[PDB]
A paper describes a structure:
Copia is enriched at the Drosophila neuromuscular junction (NMJ) and transported across synapses, and disrupting its expression promotes both synapse development and structural synaptic plasticity. Because Copia behaves in a viral-like manner, we used cryogenic-electron microscopy (cryo-EM) to determine the high-resolution structure of the Copia capsid and found that it is distinct from the related dArc1 capsid, with a larger internal capacity and the presence of pores similar to those used by retroviruses to carry out their reverse transcriptase activity. The capsid layer is composed of the Copiagag protein’s CA region, which contains 2 alpha-helical domains.
Because the Copia capsid adopts T = 9 geometry, there are 2 different hexameric capsomers along the faces (a hexamer with local 3-fold symmetry and a non-symmetric hexamer) and local refinement of each hexamer provided high-resolution maps (overall resolution of the non-symmetric and 3-fold symmetric hexamers are ~3.5-Å and 3.4-Å overall resolution, respectively). The high-quality maps of the locally refined capsomers allowed us to build an atomic model of the Copiagag protein with high confidence and good stereochemistry. The NTDs form central spokes at the center of each capsomer sub-assembly, while the CTD is arranged in the capsomer periphery. Despite the less extensive interfaces between capsid subunits in Copia, we observed an interesting interaction between adjacent CTDs that is not found in other retroelement-derived capsids. We suspect this CTD-CTD interaction plays a key role in stabilizing Copia capsids by locking down the periphery of each capsomer sub-assembly.
Numbering used by the authors:
A (entry chain E), B (entry chain F), C (entry chain C), D (entry chain D), E (entry chain A), F (entry chain B): 3 to 186
C-alpha cells in the first residue's frame, strides 16, 4: 500500500510501529493488533487476521523476517517486537543519558535543529522507560547551551517562576538567538 | 493519493501546511480544523478526526512524527507545528524587515531568483505575525530593484488604474527584464 | 491523477490551462469551471466544487499557491489566473512580434522544427489578443527563410493565386527543401 | 492507463499513431476515427468523441498540443497530424528510394542496426505515400547486403516454398550472421 | 497492467509468450487465444477480443508492431508469431547443438550457474523441436565437465544403474564440488 | 500488488520463498501448498491453484521461468525449487559448519556486517537440512566474537534469566559495541 513506511532494520522502532499501526487502521485492520478475541472465528475475523500479518511481513527487512516463521499471528509479531525493542532497559537509559549530556551547540548548527535533536533524544529516553518532569527537561536543555546564552537564562531564572515551561524557554532562546546572529 | 505534497522536513512549512489544508478540505475533513467542537460527537466527527490524523501522520517525515506520537487531536498537531515553525516574535519581524529593506538585485543574479528570495522573505515575515498588505509587498519589491527598471516602475505607479496585484507587477518586471536583456 | 501536467510556474499558461481543463473534464468535474450556478447547493454540487480546487492546487507550484488562500473557489482561481496571464496586453504582442521578426533559418535546424517554432509563436501571438489573417501568416513565414528559398517563392507568387494558404506554402517549402539538402 | 505509448515529440510518428489507434480500439472508441458520421448523434457518439479527444490530448506533448487547442474533432486532429508528419511527396519518395538503393552494410555495424535503419527507411517510404509490397521490402533488404550472405540469400530465393515474409527473412539473416561471426 | 513483461524484441520468445499468456489468464482474457469460436459474437466476446489484442500490442517493441496492422485478431497475432519464432527449424537445432558442445566449466563460474545455463540451453533445444531422452541429457552434461569431475562419474557409472537421472547426477556433482573447492 | 518481494534470481532463496508463502497465505491460497489433495476438486481448488501458479510465475525472473513452463502444479514448482536451491547434503553441512566455527570478527568490519554474515551462514546451514536450535545459534554467535565482548557475554550467559533469544543477544552485543566505540 503506502510506501512511506521504511522497512524495519532495528533502528527507530517506535516510528516503524506507529506507521504500521496507522496503515493498519487505514484499512480497518488494526482491530487485530488491539481488540477483543472472539469465542469463534468468523469470516470477518478471517481476512484481517492474515492481512495484518502480510502487511507486517511486507514492511520487514530480510533479517527480521524470522519473527513470523509462518506460525506467529499478527498481534504476536508486534508483541515479540515490543518484548525485545520496546523494553525498559537500564542500558538504553544510560546510553541515552550519556548522549544527552554530550550535546553541545555548534556555530554550524541552527538552534531549531538542535532543539529538534534534543526533543527526539528526550522522546527516546522517555520511551526507554525513564520518567522526566518538566523542570528536568529545561535542566537538560540549558546545560547544552554555550556561554553565549547565559544572561537570558538568568532573566529566565529571576523573573519567570510559574510559566517556566520547556516551550517558554525554547521560545525565549529562539527569540534571543538572532541577537547573537547579528552580533557574531 | 496526492503525491505532490512533499513531506515536512523543517523547510517551507507554509507550503506544506497550505497543501495539507487543501487536501483535508478536499476530503470533507477541514471542518474539524476550523470551526467549533460540537457537544454531540458522533461518527461524522470520529471518522473525520481519524482521517485528518492519518493524513497528517502520513505526510509527516519519520523524524517529525514526534509531534503526534501521543493521543493528540488533529487541531493540536497543527497547533504544535504552528507554535514551532510559525513562531510570533517581534524581534524576528524587525530583523527580517531590516534584511528585506537592505535587499538589492545583483547583476549576476536573474530576476527569478530575486523574486524567489523576496517571496521567501515575505513568507518569513507573515509567519512571524507581521501583517503586510499586498500594496506593501508591491512597494517592498519595487524599492528592491535597480534604476534600470525605474521607468516601468513609474508606469506601474502612475499609469496603472486597475486593482494592482503582486502577480501583475512581477509579470511586468519580467517583461521589462526581458526587454533589457534584449537591448543589452 | 494524471502526472503529465507540469506544475504551473508562470510559463506556457495556455498549455497548463488546457491540460487542467481536460483532466477536470475526465473526472466529470469541469462543470464547476464553466457551468450554471444553482440557486441552492446540493450534494452533487458539493464534491466537484472542492475537487476542482484541490486538483488546481495540486498542479500549482509553490510560488503561485497564494492564488487560492483557502477562500477562492475553483472557478475564481482560473479567473484570476486568466486576468493576469490570459490577457490582451500590448507589451506581450510587441515582444512576440519582435521575436517573430528575428527568426532566421539555420543549417543546423530542420525545416519541420522551424515550422513548428513559427506555428507556436503564431499561436502565442494570436492568444495575445492580436488577429492575424491567412496572408499575414505567409508573409511572416517567408521573411524568415534564407536566400535559398527564393525562386520557389516566385513560383508560389506567380502561379498560385487562390489556393495560397499557409498549409500549401509549408508543403511546397518542405517538398523543395530536399533539393537544397542534396545540393549543399 | 497504458504507459508504453511514448508521448509524440515529432519523432517516430507511425509508431505513436499505431499505438494510439490500438488504444482507441481497446476502449470502443476507434469507431469515430474510421467509418461515417451518423445523422442521429447521441450519447454513444458524444462520449466516444470526448474519450478520443481526451486520450489524444493526454498522449500528446506539451509543445504539440497546438494541434487540438481549438474545438476540433478527434478525426481532424489525426488528419492534421497526418498532413504534417505523413506528408505525401513524390520527390521525397524518389530521394528516399535513392538513399535506400545505395544503402549497404558496413563491417563495424551489426545486423540489428542495419535492420533498424532499413525499417526506418521503409517507414519513411510508406509515410510518403509510396506503395511497397512485402516482397519488394524483402528484395530491398536482400540487395543491401554483402556477398557473405549471398549463399543463404539464394537459399531464401530458391529453396523456400512457403509464403515468404520479412520476419522470416530477418531471422534467417540473423542466424547466418551468427554463423559467420562464429566462423570468423 | 503488470510491468514485469519485457517487450518482445526477437529474443527469448518462449518467456514472452508465457508471460503474455499468464497476464491474459489473470484478467480472464486468455479464452480468446485458446478457446471455442462462437457462432455469433456477443457482448462478452466483444471486449476480451480487443483487450487481448491491446495487451499484445502494449508489450511489443516498435519493430514488431507490424504484426497487427489493425486487422489481425488477437489469436492470429500469436499464431503468426509462433509460425516464425516457435518453429521446428533444423538450423536452430544445429546452432543450439553447437553451443551446447562448446560449454566448458571455468574456475570463475559456479556449478549451480553452469547447471542453470545447461538446463536453459536444453530447454531451448527441446523447444526447437528436437527430442532428448534422460540419458542424452546426462551425456551432454558430463561432456562439459573438466578433468576434476572424473572419478565421481565412474562412481556414477559403476554403482548407479537404475536411479541414473539428471537430478541425481546434478546432486552428486554439487555434493562433490565442495571437495574440489577446499582442495584447490 | 506487494512489490517488496524481489524476483528470484538464484540469490537468497529462503527470503523469496518466505515472502511468497506469506503472500499466498494473504490471499487464501497457501492451503494448496500445505495440506492434502481432496478427492472432490471444485472451483475452490482450481481458482486457488491458478492464483498460486500466476503469483509464482509473476514473482519469478525471466530466466527462472523454466521451472514452470509445463503444466506443473503450484506444489511441484516449489518442490523443484527446494530440490535445487535448498539441497540437503551432509558434506555441505560439515563444510559450512567448519567455515562458521572458524569465523571471527575483524577489527575493520563493523558488527552489523558480521551479524549479516553469520545470518547468511545460519541460513545456508538450515537450507542444507542441518537442525540448529536457537540456543545453538546464540552459542555460535558468541564464540565468534573477540575478547572485548567477553564480559557482556558472561552477563548474557549467567545473569540473564528470561527466555534468551537471538534478537536480544544481538541487541545487547550492538549496545556493547557502541559502548566500546565510545570508550575508544
Amino acid at each position: 500500500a503506502k510506501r512511506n513506511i521504511k522497512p524495519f532494520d532495528g533502528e527507530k522502532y517506535a516510528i516503524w510501529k506507529f506507521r504500521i499501526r496507522a496503515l493498519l487502521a487505514e484499512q480497518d485492520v488494526l482491530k487485530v493488533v488491539d481488540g477483543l478475541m472472539p469465542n469463534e472465528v468468523d469470516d470477518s475475523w478471517k481476512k484481517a487476521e492474515r492481512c495484518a500479518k502480510s502487511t507486517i511481513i511486507e514492511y520487514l527487512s530480510d533479517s527480521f523476517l524470522n519473527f513470523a516463521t509462518s506460525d506467529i499471528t499478527a498481534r504476536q509479531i508486534l508483541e515479540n517486537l515490543d518484548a525485545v525493542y520496546e523494553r525498559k532497559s537500564l542500558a538504553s537509559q544510560l546510553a541515552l543519558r550519556k548522549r544527552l549530556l554530550s550535546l553541545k551547540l555548534s556555530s554550524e548548527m541552527s538552534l531549531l535543529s538542535h532543539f529538534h535533536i534534543f526533543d527526539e533524544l528526550i522522546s527516546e529516553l522517555l520511551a526507554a522507560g525513564a520518567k522526566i518532569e518538566e523542570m528536568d527537561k529545561i535542566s537538560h536543555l540549558l546545560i547544552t547551551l554555550p556561554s553565549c546564552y547565559d544572561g537570558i537564562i538568568t532573566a529566565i531564572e529571576t523573573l519567570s517562576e510559574e510559566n517556566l515551561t520547556l516551550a517558554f524557554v525554547k521560545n525565549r532562546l529562539l527569540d534571543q538567538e538572532i541577537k547573537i546572529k547579528n552580533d557574531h
